[model samples]
Target: RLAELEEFINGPMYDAAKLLYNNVSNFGRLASTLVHLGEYQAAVDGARKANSTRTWKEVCFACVDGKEFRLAQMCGLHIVVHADELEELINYYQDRGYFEELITMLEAALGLERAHMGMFTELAILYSKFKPQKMREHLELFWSRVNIPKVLRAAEQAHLWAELVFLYDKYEEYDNAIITMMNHPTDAWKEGQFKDIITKVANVELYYRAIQFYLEFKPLLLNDLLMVLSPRLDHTRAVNYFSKVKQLPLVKPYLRSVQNHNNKSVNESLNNLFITEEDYQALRTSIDAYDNFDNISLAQRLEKHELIEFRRIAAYLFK
Candidate 1:
């Protein structure tokens, strides 16, 4: 069947018949054939001509299969305006509204194809000349059924983190919103400076979510502390301690303070205890245990021990 259709489309049959028969039925068959042959421009022209003869169903199907979505929307609007079935017409409009490109095409077709229905509730709320009694109901239905999912999918695909966070928050999915925010990518240069910030913010937000979940839920104050001290501490021990702190609340704040103080002490000790390159190297070697912490608990641990040693050696060279 495809081979026959392809042959007919490419052969003289289409070229000979098209100009002679301007009727929609002829154009409809030609459009459908052209679409199957992957002739997008020819299919669009044939579908448009078919629409002029009130062959809307053929126009709609041809446009849909040909990926001429704007034309499909135009055909849909024509069917809706003249047909008695309001609900079905609305559903057709609703279906086309999912694709932003298609919607824009539909809007462009208003003067040429048919009068703009503008039945979409959200769009109507913003642009409708007069709101009907069922306007809110229709808008809510569209939002719950179509608009929300479309926006969410777009946001996820585009990695629009801020938009995702805002949408999630609007729907009162606070924890997910925070998680989205935490996962937002920072510029490469700011990665190290922003790393601790990401972890700290996530820890606090998760703790906040846990508190909201149940009254007896223990908060992990120490996790935030661990994140704050993480810059100077051995990464492995820091991660392990942070995880432990996440599960316990009673001593969390105190433990966090201890971690902070220890971090300050480690920095001071490193500054004062080392004199020569050898001394710096030795200190770096001693702190090797700190660099083995995993970033994500489930992922393979990164080896930053060598980094500590290199920094220590650099300090000695500067001295």
Candidate 2:
């Protein structure tokens, strides 16, 4: 290598290299010959001098051929790759058990063919080896060039939520992540990021649903929040839920605060909460048919609410 470097520095062809020194094709040819002779660094200098797509490709391929892997990868990133060329390069790297070329292969394949989706999938699969932040950028670059839902799905399957979020934000495709997060029936009965989901839930003013996730995840946020929610609950279902769980943390004081309820409604509410549908039906039979819906209206409220508050769910739902 040293002799070739020194010897070729003044050889006939090297002198030809001096005369046609700036000639692009001549630079590439010099690089090719130098590479074949094991003058690797000299070959790289010539390849740099050539500065053409085909020349860089020659340098890249020669590096691969000579098992100069890191060198190959360095130049490969600068080469002009067609789709088939990229497929070959990736296959070469894959067959040789080189794990690092996934980025090189992925970027090389962009804009040449519709091969991105599959390549991106492999990149996602190989992501455990990457710095998550870098892998995230990889996904972003893939997203900008390719319209591959399968790539999205592939990342999703790998639980690449951080990467997926970056790509989504890049495309201004914002809602999907939120949809995915909220749609995850992934049971967070243990600790999950409830605060985030509920924060988002509240963003859209679905305050009622927000607290449900709040409850789903254990919280002091909840401990304080339920007290705030107690008065504004404004829904019977909400009132009933906390009342049932009143023995639990935040719900205890909250339930107590609201349990006193509206004095006017509690009397009416309790009478109905305790009344039976049987009593309602019996009253209906006693009311004269001519007496009208006033009795019937009162009668229905008693049965409907009492049934709802007392025995809200039953086999009758199916029946």
Candidate 3:
């Protein structure tokens, strides 16, 4: 199919196709081919031409990596009609217009049984932005959906659970958010089987988003674990993981900021833990020498239990 599309794109129908329906799928593929063939300008031109089709939803999706909001909006309006398309549509609206249309779409979508948690989430966000009353309504709707046992699936459940916690925080529904965050799964399970299906089948962005949402709302839970169990974990990987999380603005503040006072206390604590002054001095020197080194490595080395605990603790302390 790709080959056929490519042949059509490069053939006589190319010009007319560009005029009628310029799908991002074909354009992106063609652009990729152009890159491989060392036709850089042609690739860019092909991409631009495809984008000119004004298919906002597809453009939004295509430009997700590039974050081209203008192009996304231009393309989004033509494609998004129903609730399921709300996710892509909302991004375009947020980046272009306000959340008005997004809210309306979400409300309609939520009334259906097949309505996804993501739809509710997007609605909740818009409600929070424009009208708190509506936000509460959608949030309640989300809560009602998730509280049911039958609704708990794999990725959907995990993603929705995380998003609910996030909305709670966003609306300053702190107590509820905290309770949900604490009680929500570190790893979601179904009956007796561990459901890793979500993690396995989820798109990369969705997986990352879930992890991020979980970390955002429940950092305290994971941070506490890290503090106690860091010693038992693989120090190298823990450090790396910490470094990665810290780079993220959402997680960065939760990481222990190295202050001069804390450094002094850390040194004193090390001296107290070691057998000799020389040992303390050696350790202090190592710590000082590597102080500027990547903090992520320290996070990566921590054991799973410790890492989660650390994140949990950090959430409370930082937030």
Q: Give the top-scoring candidate (TM-score).
A: 2
> Compared with the true structure, what per-residue lDDT tens digits does model 3 show for residues 97-164?
64554455455555555666555445554554476544445545565443222222221343555555
Q: For candidate 1, lDDT tens digit of each residue in 36-118?
A: 56665566677676665445555565566556765566555555445344344445545755344434433443344433333
**lDDT at position 135, candidate 1:** 31
lDDT of 2 by residue, 57-106 (tens): 77777687777866776577554244445556666666677666656555
Residue 27 of model 2, lDDT score: 78
The estimated TM-scores of all candidates read 0.29, 0.46, 0.25
Q: lDDT per model, in order?
A: 0.44, 0.52, 0.42
Clashes of 1: 4
Native-to-model Cα distance after best TM-score fit, residue 143 in candidate 2, in Å: 12
* TM-score of candidate 1 versus the correct structure, residues matched by position: 0.29
* Candidates, ranked, lDDT: 2, 1, 3
Which runs of model 1 end up more than 4 angstroms from their true locations?
1-55, 60-73, 79-101, 108-147, 185-205, 208-319
